[model samples]
Target chain A: MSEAKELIKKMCDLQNSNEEIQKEMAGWSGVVQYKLDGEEFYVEYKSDGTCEFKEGVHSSPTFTVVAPPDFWLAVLKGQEDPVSGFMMGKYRIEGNIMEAQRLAGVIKKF
Target chain B: MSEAKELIKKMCDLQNSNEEIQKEMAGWSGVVQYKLDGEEFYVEYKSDGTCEFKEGVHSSPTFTVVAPPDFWLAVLKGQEDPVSGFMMGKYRIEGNIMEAQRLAGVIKKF
Candidate 1:
């Protein structure tokens, strides 16, 4: 029930941004993976401009982002600029870099 | 996926505010129910300055608030004042009205 988990769930709600987020990520189809503490979440954006999120790892995610809980807490709370977190090596990413940056836009929508 | 459902789930995250919300709702023991379309959620604030939330109805909610999704969308977006929404009857509440009023403070924390 921590604020971080809450915001993540908000991000997970399939109906939460059926239009806005899809439009933002439209034509930017790929898989973005996220990890916080011991939890993992995956966002799959289909070619049809649709996206779905589920807990746990993805079989073949296009990008994977791993950060500590504090990093996420800061980013979600707007206390930290996430790009800086990545630049400072506070966030570890694998695979697609631009795809991970795209996650920033979605974070603000919450 | 609507912006409305997403914020509600954030509201449901019990850990989202381990310190802040509990202090805000401290000594304000009551149930505040919320509804948007067919979705129902509740916040149970205990006298111990603690709180928890869940999706679905509370058996004996001290207050039940009903509103269309658009009403919530406006408030969450900062496009409309929640008190105005309540004053205009865009939202309906049953039981302890004052307890329901307190929820306004918590929403701002998000």
Candidate 2:
């Protein structure tokens, strides 16, 4: 697995095992896609508090984050805030902005 | 007043008039200093939701933000997030981190 995917997988694992995250994400279900440089990965989040980090694209994504791998690295590592990164034009998000924000919150929990 | 100071003054005026901001800042009082490329200014926020933008520094500051003119320009224009800017090494905050975060919230209200 690529470093970015590994990191995202870890985030999914942590969030899946976390009660607070489960409560926070109650009734929320979607797929978030990340296009890091040329590499790609997506995370599928279910209302049941289970999430899977998968390779490539998901047939449908709630939102897609397009940025460099380094940007995702910083975001997943908590070195950068996703919302701010989006604001500063460091990255672009297509589709649901609110869902992107919710995902940012979830990432913060990790 | 420099451009940054003028913008901050506007922010103070907006926050002072907004009831939500007033309620949000209830029981909060502190001095926040901004050092932007040698141009210095400070804003003193009172518990009453009144804040003053003064040129130069304050005798004591709850927190100080150090960055370039452009960095703050972007922040004041809502093109950046203060917390993420700090995390990305675009700015530095001295003193209470929480206070700095509070200030970020206040900025977002503008």
Choose the strongest candidate by TM-score.
2
Q: How accurate is candidate 1 locally (lDDT)?
A: 0.58
Residue B98 shift from truth in candidate 2, angstroms: 5.4
| Model 2 regions lying over 4 Å from their true place | A1-110, B97-110
TM-score quality measure for candidate 2: 0.44
lDDT by residue (B44-71, candidate 2, tens digit) is: 8787867787888897676677878886
Which residue window of length 10 is worst by lDDT in model 2 chain A?
Answer: A101-110
Best by DockQ: 2
Of all true interface contacts, what fraction is found in model 1? 0.00
Best by lDDT: 2
Give lDDT per model, in order.
Answer: 0.58, 0.64
Instruction: For model 2, name the residue pairs that clash.
Output: none
- Model 1 segments beyond 4 Å from truth? A14-18, A96-110, B1-110
Candidate 1 local Cα displacement, residue B46, angstroms? 56
